[PDB]
Structure 1
Amino acid sequence: MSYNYVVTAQKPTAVNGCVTGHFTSAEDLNLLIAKNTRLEIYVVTAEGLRPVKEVGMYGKIAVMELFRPKGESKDLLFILTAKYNACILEYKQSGESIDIITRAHGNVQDRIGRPSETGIIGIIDPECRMIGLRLYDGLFKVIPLDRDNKELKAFNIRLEELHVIDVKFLYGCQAPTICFVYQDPQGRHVKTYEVSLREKEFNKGPWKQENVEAEASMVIAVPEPFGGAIIIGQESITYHNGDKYLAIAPPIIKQSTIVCHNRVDPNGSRYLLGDMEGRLFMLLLEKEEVTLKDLRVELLGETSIAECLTYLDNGVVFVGSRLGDSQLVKLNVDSNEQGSYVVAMETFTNLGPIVDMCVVDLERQGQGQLVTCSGAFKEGSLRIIRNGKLHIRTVPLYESPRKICYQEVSQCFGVLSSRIEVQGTTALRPSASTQALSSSVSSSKLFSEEVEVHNLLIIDQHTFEVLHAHQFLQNEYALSLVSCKLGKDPNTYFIVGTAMVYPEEAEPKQGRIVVFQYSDGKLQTVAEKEVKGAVYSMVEFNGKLLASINSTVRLYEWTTEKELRTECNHYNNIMALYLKTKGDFILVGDLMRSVLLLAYKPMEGNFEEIARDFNPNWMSAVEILDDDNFLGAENAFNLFVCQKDSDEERQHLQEVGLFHLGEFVNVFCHGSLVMPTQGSVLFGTVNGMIGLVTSLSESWYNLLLDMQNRLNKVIKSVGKIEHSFWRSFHTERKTEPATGFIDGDLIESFLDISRPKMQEVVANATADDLIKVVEELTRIH
């Protein structure tokens, strides 16, 4: 059995939800921001935001909504976790002490059910008579609130429409009325029901179903003066009240789909709307003496790519982003002479989707340094991270970075990047690839709306300026990058694996491996090799190039002629997406077969499948910890450690460790951010968390385990969620308890308790010894 210690080096930074209201006090205007596991409570002051609390939920917050039941002095907060832990929380401040008391809690996971495509939806009746959850197709779970529960007993109402896009509660309805857009083979239609808690079933809605736009994707419940709802689609905005049918098709919203909204006024006379391209629009409801007269949309300006947004007051809008830095912007009454009324007041750092990252000992110290490809289309950037607290630099690229590698000899970073051109083609903005000192385009003899143009950026590792930007072939996606010297020649090369992407196919049939050399400030194409598929991953393997074309993991040798020559192939993969190496061994992360311990036997010259895990885990990343431990990340936000067992049963890798991280790990890398534990594997996630995995010894792990159980007995979670449940390995077809992994955050929380609670933890050595142990554990990050 394996022994692993996971700890959060950097807490998640991507905001997946933001709600405003009066949570802390009846007079305070609170901003509650849900970063993946962290709930941050700020008080909206006249300027900026004053953090009042930051709690760590044992759960990925999928829903976060504030509601005020009748007779309640201040808002209660409903949080649903991705593992379906529901909790109603109240803020209770006793002088200096701050407590988030769990007014109610429960688990609303149905044992069976297809999780809905559009994701978990959570809504609350505007009069706070119930909570409506859309977790599974064909069902609509209802948690009554008038029946004051402490267990959140819920009941499912069967919903005849099986593909529901969005759903809201309508305003000004005597009965709880849901209005939802759903997809059937005839098209997309908006329908209404009136939920009955007594009969526990739907009833005919106030107004019948109406056929809406093909991409009608958003429902906005308008307040009482207008009533009804507004449906936002890709091309049009419609407003329904049962007999009022207003419609507009503003050409300015056609270019990008609207993905978020928020109500500015209490009466809904104005709404904010963010698109995926970052544009912020104001949708205005013009009243007539009340009914609704006409709809207008005006482009306020541009912000970060907003996952969510919330109007606080005084023209201040919090734009919470998953793909870039969150923003606190000001909506001026008058334009800024560039057609934009939006002005950024503050920026909150967000390590966006950390797609790739490399540890570099830059400045020739003994300290590691993480250079991470963070963010996405317009918010893409490089982030440089050191221990100083964690200091984070930012190098805006204005295009999505995909891969990064460090070439120490050339004193530069090779960064794969991708930008969107609309039309032959035109760039939507000046991106880092276009702003290089020098530039080049591939002229390859091998091959002969909006499109993605992929580039290799050579970036100076002192000033982080784009020394060079080599654009790839038309419709060519660069997938992999490795900086290594092959064969026996001394030159160090940037080797880029690519794929030819056309709309007519689902899997690339064409691709090439291009060997560049960066010298004299120029990127010469040293070599090429047409291959018959997408080169998803490449790695240097004992001076050779181990690549993974669609399903084949094959090895190329660098000849004296400076060309790549195949030496061996392995075909027993669905798609070998991830490749790692230690010695003669290779670890192949597969799309859904999840690992394969391969070995290159040099005495013969082919691969040998040493072992495999036959559990169907869908992979996101993979790493090699020890000679016989293999870390892997599943797409269901789990870590698992496989071990070469000890006949044909020897070919079975045994999952000796399981853990639910709650984060989508995108990349592993050996290294540490500092100057007792064996090894150090940093990992980067989609929500921005950077974590760290280390191997422990047996007795120490047992002692730590004991501490984890004791703390679970002592420390009380916010939603009364059991820590073992939160860290239980979870997949749609499997559920196991955590084994072989110590939650470093929980252990490090041992410092943040008072001495009587420590003595409670250490009832059966002394507390000071364990304080020393946890301090030493904190030293590694």
Structure 2
Amino acid sequence: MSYNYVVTAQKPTAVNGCVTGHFTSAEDLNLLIAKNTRLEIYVVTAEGLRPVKEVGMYGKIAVMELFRPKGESKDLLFILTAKYNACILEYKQSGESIDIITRAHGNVQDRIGRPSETGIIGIIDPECRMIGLRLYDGLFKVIPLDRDNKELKAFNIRLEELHVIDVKFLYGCQAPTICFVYQDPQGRHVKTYEVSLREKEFNKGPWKQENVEAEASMVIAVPEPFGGAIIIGQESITYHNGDKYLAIAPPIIKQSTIVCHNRVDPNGSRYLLGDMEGRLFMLLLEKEEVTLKDLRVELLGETSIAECLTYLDNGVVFVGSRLGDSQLVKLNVDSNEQGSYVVAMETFTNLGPIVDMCVVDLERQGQGQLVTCSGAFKEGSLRIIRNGKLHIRTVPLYESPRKICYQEVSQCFGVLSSRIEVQTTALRPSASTQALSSSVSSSKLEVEVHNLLIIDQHTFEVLHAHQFLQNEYALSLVSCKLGKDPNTYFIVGTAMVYPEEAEPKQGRIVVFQYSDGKLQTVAEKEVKGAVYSMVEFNGKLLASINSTVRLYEWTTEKELRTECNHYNNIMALYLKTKGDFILVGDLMRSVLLLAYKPMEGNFEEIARDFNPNWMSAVEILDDDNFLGAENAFNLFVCQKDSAATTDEERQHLQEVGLFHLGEFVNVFCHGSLVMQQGSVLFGTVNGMIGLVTSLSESWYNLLLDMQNRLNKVIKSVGKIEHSFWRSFHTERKTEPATGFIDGDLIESFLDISRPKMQEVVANLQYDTADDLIKVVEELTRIH
């Protein structure tokens, strides 16, 4: 059948979130970085952060809360499982031992309801008596916070307003009152509701609804002393202690909207803010002799696009940037040209988001490196990840990295890019300005135009920044052989997308050739509209376009003519050609198996995944098994079911192999981290380097009963069942994973205790006991 071993090589480095507070002690501040599938405790020290233990968690953290309720010395961590499973966590120690226990447990999953695309908003009231959870638009679930409550149960309060932008609590009030901005067709406004546990309903708050801007989004809670509500829209920053209106509108905010914020002063006088670019801001609240007197803003320099900010001791702010590396920024009194009153105290590494990568062993002789296109724009950097073990060489491009392929005629790396220029004077100095040679394409058949920037392999310097025309946007890039010519041509599928048109009607696929430092054009093939990812079928350029999948034949007279006319496809977003099988990945038609026939001249539809799932990444393992990734973080391997009875079901791909992954795959590759039965790698957005090893039939049964017997012994924080979590989030079907081996659980056996090994090997007699301890080391030595 289809048996695969999914094992990770590196932990996710993208900072999903962070929360600070006295977790371990009452005086020791602790930064709990809630990353993907893990929660790491960091002791705030003079040197910065000090790790003690990283506690793994089932999937991402939807809601994270570090709060101390009335009568508690330790922060009560609140973790919401991605399968909507709420559990109150409590820190416990017995001799400098990191052992977080569980105060309460109860699932909050609902059978019906439209999920909030904005996100599940989880907040705790200032009185620490209820749980403010916004699961669905218009559906508020409140869990009674009691000291003697172990079963977490949330009742359904029908929020009158169907759709809301952001929900917050009114800090400073002596009642459970909230401040939320609802969304109406007549205009978005703010309202106050009372969450009374005695009536189980919403009630009129202190003041009525207020007329705000029709663009107001992020809501910043005003602390207890000042009182009120600060709502920042696209530009205006309004203040509403009561029926007072104090709105300041800085033009700089209009462009870069406020995304995150940070409370430096407990009073609320200094409130650090974060925009969508990285420029650091800080509000200045002055208590009018508490009502606000005036509101000012300042620029504190630019950082990597952040997401969650937490204030530490001695003026330290943790910048949890997801796009680009995360750096510990220490607030100081220094001043310069940009007035950046901040310094880079520490610098942490990051691998995601991996847009594109490839395994090249030119000077590696096996054990090829990983050129992950991490970050975007200014944070766009080619992290040269190479196993020794993983050394990371940051190559800053200051421009968005798009597609990268391997060129064997000039030992370089052709990387597409789309720099941002204010409408068109440039803004940031990208690699194009730092390049050697620049020219435009010949034919002609704010703004982010596509530009081809080929970078060397050893010098890491852009040799040619050959840009394209205006309104020219590429989507694919093939750097392999075409026809009988062994030279790796640069077939770039560009498109003439006009800013006034709404449908793709003009395009031009150009072909170039890199010859000893010179990007010389070959010819051009104008097309209709925008094209998608294309892969050369045995050298022959197989076109993708949109619905019409063609095969352009390369001749000897410099001409590319079409030879196929396949209209069954709707989208060629994930087109892969292996052997003779042509696998087109459609968004709605999912996996479609094709086959080219020279005697006919068209791809015959032989197999097709009957499930209409939204694909995200495809991969061809063998001639019958094909791995597919879904947008709902689920893996599935379909088998070739072309030998049935009815001619209708023969075109249906039987899905047997099914897996619950958790991460979003963006690109696939082929290789391994060892020089000289599986070599399938893929880059994820969260920064997880994954390896799929096609396990054999004799080795699949050795870990089948071992994984099932380990779920009832090694549990997570909250007595949560592992198999229950290992279920798909697919809307079509919610099923437990079948046909796969979870590598994560197998890894736990390497650092497991000594007497715990006999509890899982005594029920297996391989023709056993000590043999299972040696065979698990080979699964980790392959990367």
TM-score, with normalisation over the residues of structure 1?
A: 0.97
Distance 1:148 1:323 in 2: 42
| Per-residue deviation, 1:364 | 4.3
- Asked if the contact 1:357/1:669 (under 8 Å) is kept, the reply is yes
Distance 1:506 1:761 in 2: 61
Q: Number of aligned residue pairs: give it.
A: 774
- Asked if the contact 1:380/1:399 (under 8 Å) is kept, the reply is yes
| Per-residue deviation, 1:506 | 4.8
Greater shift after overlay, 630-639 or 383-392? 383-392
Greater shift after overlay, 494-503 or 211-220? 494-503
- Asked if the contact 1:19/1:33 (under 8 Å) is kept, the reply is yes
Distance 1:362 1:384 in 2: 14
| Per-residue deviation, 1:195 | 0.5
| Per-residue deviation, 1:720 | 3.0
- Asked if the contact 1:264/1:270 (under 8 Å) is kept, the reply is yes
| Per-residue deviation, 1:148 | 3.8
- Asked if the contact 1:711/1:750 (under 8 Å) is kept, the reply is no
| Per-residue deviation, 1:563 | 2.5
Distance 1:266 1:184 in 2: 34
Distance 2:531 2:455 in 1: 23
List per-residue Cα deviations over 1:586-618 (Å, max 9, x = no partner): 211111221111111223322111211121211
- Asked if the contact 1:188/1:216 (under 8 Å) is kept, the reply is yes
Distance 2:37 2:133 in 1: 20
Q: Secondary structure at the match of 1:552?
A: coil
Indicate how the Cα distance of structure 1 residues 643 and 774 shifts in structure 2: closer, same or farther if over 3 A, else same. same
List per-residue Cα deviations over 1:172-197 (Å, max 9, x = no partner): 32331111111101111011101011
Q: Secondary structure at the match of 2:712?
A: helix
List per-residue Cα deviations over 1:205-261 (Å, max 9, x = no partner): 111111222221111111111111100111110011222221100122222111111
Alignment of 1:20-419 (within 5 A): 20-146=20-146, 148-419=148-419
| Per-residue deviation, 1:378 | 2.0
| Per-residue deviation, 1:62 | 1.9
Indicate how the Cα distance of structure 1 residues 718 and 569 shifts in structure 2: closer, same or farther if over 3 A, else same. farther
Indicate how the Cα distance of structure 1 residues 506 and 75 shifts in structure 2: closer, same or farther if over 3 A, else same. farther
- Asked if the contact 1:263/1:272 (under 8 Å) is kept, the reply is yes
| Per-residue deviation, 1:620 | 1.1
| Per-residue deviation, 1:288 | 2.0
Q: Secondary structure at the match of 2:259?
A: strand
Indicate how the Cα distance of structure 1 residues 564 and 148 shifts in structure 2: closer, same or farther if over 3 A, else same. farther
Distance 1:93 1:521 in 2: 63
Distance 2:82 2:601 in 1: 47
Q: Which runs of 5+ in 1 are unaligned?
A: none
| Per-residue deviation, 1:285 | 1.0
RMSD: 1.5
List per-residue Cα deviations over 1:24-54 (Å, max 9, x = no partner): 1111111111222221111111221111221
Q: Secondary structure at the match of 2:503?
A: coil
Q: Secondary structure at the match of 2:476?
A: strand
Q: Secondary structure at the match of 2:780?
A: helix
Distance 2:538 2:588 in 1: 27
Distance 2:163 2:378 in 1: 31
Indicate how the Cα distance of structure 1 residues 157 and 455 shifts in structure 2: closer, same or farther if over 3 A, else same. same
Indicate how the Cα distance of structure 1 residues 301 and 719 shifts in structure 2: closer, same or farther if over 3 A, else same. farther
Distance 1:372 1:610 in 2: 35
| Per-residue deviation, 1:652 | 0.5
Distance 1:546 1:83 in 2: 41
List per-residue Cα deviations over 1:247-301 (Å, max 9, x = no partner): 1001222221111111111122211111111111011211122322111111111
- Asked if the contact 2:355/2:402 (under 8 Å) is kept, the reply is yes
Distance 1:376 1:767 in 2: 50
| Per-residue deviation, 1:507 | 4.5
Distance 1:127 1:53 in 2: 31
Distance 2:501 2:769 in 1: 63
Distance 1:232 1:53 in 2: 37
TM-score, with normalisation over the residues of structure 2?
A: 0.96
- Asked if the contact 2:301/2:338 (under 8 Å) is kept, the reply is no
**Matched residue, 2:775:** 773
List per-residue Cα deviations over 1:499-555 (Å, max 9, x = no partner): 233344555332222111011311112121111121110111111011210222211
| Per-residue deviation, 1:158 | 0.8
Q: Secondary structure at the match of 1:710?
A: helix
| Per-residue deviation, 1:168 | 0.8
List per-residue Cα deviations over 1:722-780 (Å, max 9, x = no partner): 2223321212332111012211111111112102211122230x442112121111112
Q: Secondary structure at the match of 1:669?
A: strand
Greater shift after overlay, 288-297 or 111-120? 288-297
| Per-residue deviation, 1:396 | 0.8
Q: Secondary structure at the match of 2:724?
A: helix
| Per-residue deviation, 1:170 | 1.0
List per-residue Cα deviations over 1:70-89 (Å, max 9, x = no partner): 21111011111332122221
Distance 1:234 1:307 in 2: 17
Distance 2:364 2:780 in 1: 25
Distance 1:130 1:433 in 2: 54
- Asked if the contact 1:89/1:103 (under 8 Å) is kept, the reply is yes
| Per-residue deviation, 1:99 | 1.0
- Asked if the contact 1:278/1:303 (under 8 Å) is kept, the reply is yes
- Asked if the contact 1:57/1:719 (under 8 Å) is kept, the reply is no
| Per-residue deviation, 1:10 | 1.6
Alignment of 1:7-18 (within 5 A): 7-18=7-18
Indicate how the Cα distance of structure 1 residues 507 and 712 shifts in structure 2: closer, same or farther if over 3 A, else same. farther
How many percent of aligned residue pairs carry the same amino acid?
100
Indicate how the Cα distance of structure 1 residues 159 and 504 shifts in structure 2: closer, same or farther if over 3 A, else same. farther
- Asked if the contact 1:638/1:662 (under 8 Å) is kept, the reply is yes
Distance 1:499 1:690 in 2: 32
- Asked if the contact 2:707/2:746 (under 8 Å) is kept, the reply is yes
Indicate how the Cα distance of structure 1 residues 315 and 491 shifts in structure 2: closer, same or farther if over 3 A, else same. same
Distance 1:769 1:480 in 2: 49
Distance 1:565 1:488 in 2: 16
- Asked if the contact 1:175/1:196 (under 8 Å) is kept, the reply is no
Distance 2:732 2:503 in 1: 27
Q: Secondary structure at the match of 1:151?
A: coil
List per-residue Cα deviations over 1:647-675 (Å, max 9, x = no partner): 33121111121212111100111111112
Distance 1:651 1:686 in 2: 33
List per-residue Cα deviations over 1:439-482 (Å, max 9, x = no partner): 11223231xxx111211111000121111111122122211111
Alignment of 1:421 onto 2:421: yes
Indicate how the Cα distance of structure 1 residues 101 and 506 shifts in structure 2: closer, same or farther if over 3 A, else same. farther
Distance 1:559 1:203 in 2: 76
Distance 2:351 2:141 in 1: 35
List per-residue Cα deviations over 1:690-716 (Å, max 9, x = no partner): 111111112321221211112111112
- Asked if the contact 1:187/1:211 (under 8 Å) is kept, the reply is no
| Per-residue deviation, 1:580 | 1.3
| Per-residue deviation, 1:484 | 0.9
- Asked if the contact 2:444/2:469 (under 8 Å) is kept, the reply is no
Indicate how the Cα distance of structure 1 residues 507 and 80 shifts in structure 2: closer, same or farther if over 3 A, else same. farther
- Asked if the contact 1:229/1:241 (under 8 Å) is kept, the reply is yes
- Asked if the contact 1:372/1:404 (under 8 Å) is kept, the reply is no
Indicate how the Cα distance of structure 1 residues 510 and 741 shifts in structure 2: closer, same or farther if over 3 A, else same. farther
| Per-residue deviation, 1:165 | 0.7
Distance 2:756 2:611 in 1: 41
- Asked if the contact 2:408/2:488 (under 8 Å) is kept, the reply is no
Distance 1:440 1:726 in 2: 54
Q: Secondary structure at the match of 1:187?
A: coil
Greater shift after overlay, 733-742 or 720-729? 720-729
| Per-residue deviation, 1:147 | 5.9
- Asked if the contact 2:299/2:338 (under 8 Å) is kept, the reply is no
Q: Secondary structure at the match of 1:306?
A: coil
| Per-residue deviation, 1:433 | 2.5
Q: Secondary structure at the match of 1:231?
A: strand
- Asked if the contact 1:17/1:34 (under 8 Å) is kept, the reply is yes
| Per-residue deviation, 1:362 | 3.3
Q: Which runs of 5+ in 2 are unaligned?
A: none
